[PDB]
Amino acid sequence: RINTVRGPITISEAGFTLTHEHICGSSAGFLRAWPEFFGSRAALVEKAVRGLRRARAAGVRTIVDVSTFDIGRDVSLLAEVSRAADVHIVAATGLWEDPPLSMRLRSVEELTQFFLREIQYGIEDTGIRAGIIKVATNGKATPFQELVLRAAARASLATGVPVTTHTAASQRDGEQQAAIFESEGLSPSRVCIGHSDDTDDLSYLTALAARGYLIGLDGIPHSAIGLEDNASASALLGNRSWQTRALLIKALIDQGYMKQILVSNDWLFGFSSYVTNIMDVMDSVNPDGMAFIPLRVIPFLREKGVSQETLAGITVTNPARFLSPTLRA
Amino acid sequence: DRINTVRGPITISEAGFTLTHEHICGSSAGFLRAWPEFFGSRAALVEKAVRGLRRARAAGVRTIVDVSTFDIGRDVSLLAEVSRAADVHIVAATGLWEDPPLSMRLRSVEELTQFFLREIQYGIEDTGIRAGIIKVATNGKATPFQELVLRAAARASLATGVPVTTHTAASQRDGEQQAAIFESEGLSPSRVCIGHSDDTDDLSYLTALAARGYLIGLDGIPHSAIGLEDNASASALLGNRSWQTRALLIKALIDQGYMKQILVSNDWLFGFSSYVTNIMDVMDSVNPDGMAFIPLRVIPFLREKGVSQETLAGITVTNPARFLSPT
Ligand SMILES: [Zn+2]
Ligand SMILES: [Zn+2]
Ligand SMILES: [Zn+2]
Ligand SMILES: [Zn+2]
Ligand SMILES: [Zn+2]
């Protein structure tokens, strides 16, 4: 079994799983302190329920919400939307790139305890346990990010839960990350190196994949084509097309790495940790939201000659093996 | 007529002896809820703070102003609980301090104004508890975002009458830049307390600010790492000036004619996660009296220097009431 925001589910009930998504990309405490930023808490809920229902109609059964503490994860929000949409949501622990002082001053042992708490005991006072550990680098790891990476490995080794990562793909961050994880004795098959579709460097991806890493091609609909006059949207989403990102999926399949691929949208229904209009801009580019993978990417790859079975492997089996907790150390 | 507290509105006269710069818990947004075991447990933090506030109350404190912002991890439901159980009024704060997350740092002056106004006029989170003060911060020259926060604070104060209180690097004379920015928004100096002003010995800095009508926050009196010289992290944070040195600035400002503009406090806390792990224990080892330090230690030390009880009642009762009463 895998832990979700509504309790444990069996591996087979996870079905078509999006491995890197967010209900709401925010900051710790922010959604409760200033819900009017999002219209209201009720408006965000409804928005997210409609978006998940759209993904569900397109075949999605589970999403992994990789929002950490410092992404302003609100597991009570996740539970409410999961119940109303009847889509499974796996919650995350870990730290992303905006830790407050109370986190940044912590030792590797302290961070370890924090992640274990969220995995073994629960998040806040909800009883909801995390099913994945999320970490981040944006180039060379800061000394604090290193501690975060080792604490994550240590927590993964003790619990069986997988690790997923945020990278600056163009800086090949995956290489440093792997080296740190391997230094802690963590198996590559329990690690997804994320935002790997942000780069066209196939030889970086294939080398990681040959090592047993999972390759997170998780931002397929991220693109500022048509929004070139909007510098903030362009900076965030990139000027590479969704088609270009999607052809990475095909390229890895073609080089023999199907079993190392994970795909997602990296979408959200609210977004406060960037410029004020950004969610509206993103919505105008990709109204399908989280349904983009099933409605757009799958048809595109099928007509390129990727089989239905290969795609079910990537979207159902590959996530099931990743999320299934392995034996404790 | 009325000051907002975590238990609702009170009249001015109910405030009594007020500590104007305190914290129940120095932390970070969301942290107390996500990792209460950092503090032993939520229950232990509660019990610690209630005992500490009861001790201050027995020493004569009737109100504290908890200047913990959102990014100090202010938990108003915690403030409410400890206030109720210690029968000490607590005034809560809006504003922002030096550790805003991205969701705050990306906001415009207009957005931030709307946030501070919400916490004052509507309530904090979903609790209906309204802030009675706005807290801001610089540590030397203001960053561009800190300039926005200063301006939004002035605008929020101008709309509501609630006062503004500040964190400074006093030795970089931050109060001058803070004052410059506030006055460019049309804020009256009498609505502003320039805090951590006991961190400097430059009396001419303080008296020039006080001569323009600013309140002077001598708010860290018991902060001292005297006897803790082998502890780099405590020394860096608490400094090596004695409490008596800090308290003597209270007297120096009385002697210079500024008794009506002095605000005194401990800047104490009952939990502390936003620094090194041991720090609350280290701080408790040097000031076991906690928030009772002003009434039990500073008041008698000033009385023996020849400060009258009348002057002390003015500083600890009259000044905070005039400062907190909305205009
Ligand atoms: Zn990311
Ligand atoms: Zn993401
Ligand atoms: Zn195929
Ligand atoms: Zn301060
Ligand atoms: Zn303080």
Swiss-Prot record, chain A:
The EC number(s) this enzyme carries: 3.1.8.1
The keyword Cell inner membrane is annotated on this UniProt entry: no
Cofactor(s) listed in the protein's UniProt record: Zn(2+)
CDD domains: PTE (cd00530)
Positions where N6-carboxylysine occurs in the chain: K134
Reactions performed catalytically: An aryl dialkyl phosphate + H2O = dialkyl phosphate + an aryl alcohol
Usage in biotechnology: Has attracted interest because of its potential use in the detoxification of chemical waste and warfare agents and its ability to degrade agricultural pesticides such as parathion.
Enzyme class: hydrolase
Keywords for the protein's UniProt record, in alphabetical order: Cell membrane, Hydrolase, Membrane, Metal-binding, Plasmid, Signal, Zinc
Entry's Gene Ontology molecular function annotations: aryldialkylphosphatase activity; zinc ion binding
The record's account of how the chain is modified after translation: Predicted to be exported by the Tat system. The position of the signal peptide cleavage has been experimentally proven.
Annotated Zn(2+) 1 binding sites: H20, H22, K134, D266
Keyword Hydrolase: yes
Pfam families: PTE (PF02126)
SUPFAM superfamilies, per the entry: Metallo-dependent hydrolases
GO BP term, pick one: catabolic process
Compartments, as annotated in UniProt: Cell membrane
Residues that bind Zn(2+) 2: K134, H166, H195
Protein's membrane topology: Peripheral membrane protein
Subunit text: Homodimer.
Function: Has an unusual substrate specificity for synthetic organophosphate triesters and phosphorofluoridates. All of the phosphate triesters found to be substrates are synthetic compounds. The identity of any naturally occurring substrate for the enzyme is unknown. Has no detectable activity with phosphate monoesters or diesters and no activity as an esterase or protease. It catalyzes the hydrolysis of the insecticide paraoxon at a rate approaching the diffusion limit and thus appears to be optimally evolved for utilizing this synthetic substrate.
Family under the similarity heading: Belongs to the metallo-dependent hydrolases superfamily. Phosphotriesterase family.
PANTHER family linked: PHOSPHOTRIESTERASE-RELATED, PHOSPHOTRIESTERASE-RELATED PROTEIN
Protein name: Parathion hydrolase
From Swiss-Prot, chain B:
Any Pfam family the entry gives: PTE
Keywords, in A-Z order: Cell membrane, Hydrolase, Membrane, Metal-binding, Plasmid, Signal, Zinc
Molecular function GO terms recorded: aryldialkylphosphatase activity; zinc ion binding
Enzyme nomenclature, EC number: 3.1.8.1
Chain residues that bind Zn(2+) 1: H21, H23, K135, D267
Coiled coil start-end: none
GO cellular component: plasma membrane
PTM annotation (N6-carboxylysine): residues: K135
Biotechnology: Has attracted interest because of its potential use in the detoxification of chemical waste and warfare agents and its ability to degrade agricultural pesticides such as parathion.
Topological category with respect to the lipid bilayer: Peripheral membrane protein
Gene3D superfamilies reported in the protein's UniProt record: Metal-dependent hydrolases (3.20.20.140)
Mod. after translation: Predicted to be exported by the Tat system. The position of the signal peptide cleavage has been experimentally proven.
Compartments, as annotated in UniProt: Cell membrane
Cofactor(s) the protein requires to work: Zn(2+)
Catalytic function, reaction form: An aryl dialkyl phosphate + H2O = dialkyl phosphate + an aryl alcohol
GO BP, one annotated term: catabolic process
Cited InterPro entries: AryldialkylPase_Zn-BS, Metal_Hydrolase, Phosphotriesterase, TAT_signal
Cofactor note: Binds 2 Zn(2+) ions per subunit.
List of residues binding Zn(2+) 2: K135, H167, H196
Main localization, broad class: membrane
Chain's role: Has an unusual substrate specificity for synthetic organophosphate triesters and phosphorofluoridates. All of the phosphate triesters found to be substrates are synthetic compounds. The identity of any naturally occurring substrate for the enzyme is unknown. Has no detectable activity with phosphate monoesters or diesters and no activity as an esterase or protease. It catalyzes the hydrolysis of the insecticide paraoxon at a rate approaching the diffusion limit and thus appears to be optimally evolved for utilizing this synthetic substrate.
Family indicated by similarity: Belongs to the metallo-dependent hydrolases superfamily. Phosphotriesterase family.
Subunit architecture: Homodimer.
Protein name, UniProt field: Parathion hydrolase
Organism expressing this protein natively: Brevundimonas diminuta
